[PDB]
Ligand binder design. Structure first.
Ligand SMILES: Cc1ccncc1NC(=O)[C@H](C)C1CCCCC1
Ligand SMILES: Cc1ccncc1NC(=O)[C@H](C)C1CCCCC1
Lengths: 304, 304
């Protein structure tokens, strides 16, 4: 028992991190097979950053201008291409530490682990959610660009995020591994509106189930609700409307605990309307939304 | 910017995890050089667990009774010995993935990362603090015994914890890597008093500094306090008394932000006396104590 904000073991991803330098800029790259992936803004300088013309900036670069170093060793670049907001540097050596991997585009509300890196070296790992507004609330300083987000299913790493930018509000934006930004963001130093965010309702319910499984049950009440009634409350409190698909995903947790999903919704309604009254749930004094129902099941069953 | 509960990259520790089986019991072991370390209770059965006579139980075991498997490969055990609550199984092969490492006994209030494992396979990584009462609030199910806690300083892994037991209260207990329990705990299935715990004051102050560095400053006030006055408040609220040694450790954060440590203490006093008023600090609705001043500096500077 006990419930923690757990990240995936980062070892398989640590073996893929490299440092990429182009001119004056250094950031992180992801070396999988014979390709190194990194944010395309590695080719910019300070003057370029307001509205870079990436196609033109890249035309001034040759394979030998991209310095790729995997700690002790220098990689030989034999090709370069830009795909959306990422550069793909073909190298002459396949990464001997390439794990089984996939590139996936995650949905908002899904979670993943980030391995924060500086100069191609890993500094730490943390779990986070892709906000409904397509931002992430990470921990990234200048130089962390190119750090990646991922999930692991047995021996397969699904890479879902590459870090590109910090918005002026201090929230983070990035792309899938094909270089497509999550959200409306563009890789330029401009103020950019992140949409209105919402709380991930299905994740809060999943975390309430993890709380009951682990002994925190003070919030369970004698009430029930309907999806319609609950969604009026979700509306008032900027929570995502709950759907039958969300109820269906919560099925295993509802079955294991014997607490009907709409009964848990009535606990959540009361917590939204009355607050925690100075109490905590799983060490938190707020309603946590960074655990998906899959995360709760995985953690509560000890999946490796 | 942004501040997260970050764990160390777990790769160097993943390469050391093995599965140890003795009879009917399977748990995790730590393979460093030619020795595998695991909790001594791997030699117990269900009948033994109320008050095992470990010396007698171990005498019924031979090297060939300890089955050690590092995924695809079986290790040959050529020696066994019990040191405090750990067993040390000498194997004929040095772990080729042995990182530079140290065994350290951490102080209460210090933090570390745990790589939770089942059957020698890593499931996840999380950061936690050793409570002032020598327990940890982890996430461990049956089979996670032998999972370890550690810190990393550049290329050196300092192992500080091995998981042994879940107390009847759902909190966790374990040993240093010489098998000495942190706290009063004994490896037997009995109800055991964990002392009165307290909040790690120096860590809360460090986290208030991380909050100011990252833009959350609403809690700063026009007041100051003294160590004496602050400690009367710390007393009332079950916080550790602050000492000049704690003020000294906060020096770098005080210098970087320009907020005198006693001025931050006066912010903390007001938060203790008035609560958060429904507001948050770094995404938390409570005063966080799982970040040491060293953690804050490391995270806010991007150390690898
Ligand atoms: C500073 C920082 C901190 C954390 N994460 C990222 C960054 N870097 C930036 O967001 C650049 C300013 C941006 C990058 C995209 C192109 C325009 C320039
Ligand atoms: C169940 C569980 C969950 C999480 N962590 C550990 C455990 N296992 C135990 O604490 C045993 C009961 C204990 C181990 C010490 C010797 C007496 C028996």
């Amino acid at each position: 028992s006990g419930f923690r904000k757990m990240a995936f073991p980062s070892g398989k991803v640590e073996g893929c991190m490299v440092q990429v330098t182009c001119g004056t800029t250094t950031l992180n790259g992801l070396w999988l097979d014979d390709v190194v992936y990194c944010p395309r803004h590695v080719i910019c300088t300070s003057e370029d950053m307001l509205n870079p013309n990436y196609e033109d900036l890249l035309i001034r670069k040759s394979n030998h201008n991209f310095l790729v170093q995997a700690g002790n060793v220098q990689l030989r670049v034999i090709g370069h291409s830009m795909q959306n907001c990422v550069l793909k540097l073909k190298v002459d050596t396949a990464n001997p530490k390439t794990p089984k991997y996939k590139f996936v585009r995650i949905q908002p509300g899904q979670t993943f682990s980030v391995l924060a890196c500086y100069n191609g070296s890993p500094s730490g790992v943390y779990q986070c959610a892709m906000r409904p507004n397509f931002t992430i609330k990470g921990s990234f300083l200048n130089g962390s660009c190119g750090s990646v987000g991922f999930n692991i299913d047995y021996d397969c790493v699904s890479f879902c995020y590459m870090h590109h930018m910090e918005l002026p509000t201090g929230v983070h934006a990035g792309t899938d591994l094909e270089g497509n930004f999550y959200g409306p963001f563009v890789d330029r130093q401009t103020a950019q509106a992140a949409g209105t965010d919402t709380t991930i309702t299905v994740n809060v319910l999943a975390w309430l189930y993890a709380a009951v499984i682990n002994g925190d049950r003070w919030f369970l009440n004698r009430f029930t609700t309907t999806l319609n009634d609950f969604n009026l409350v979700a509306m008032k409190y900027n929570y995502e409307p709950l759907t039958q698909d969300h109820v269906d995903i919560l099925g295993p947790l509802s079955a294991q605990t014997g607490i009907a999903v709409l009964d848990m919704c009535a606990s959540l309604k009361e917590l939204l309307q009355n607050g925690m009254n100075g109490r905590t749930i799983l060490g938190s004094a707020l309603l946590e939304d960074e655990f998906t129902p899959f995360d709760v099941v995985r953690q509560c069953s000890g999946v490796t």
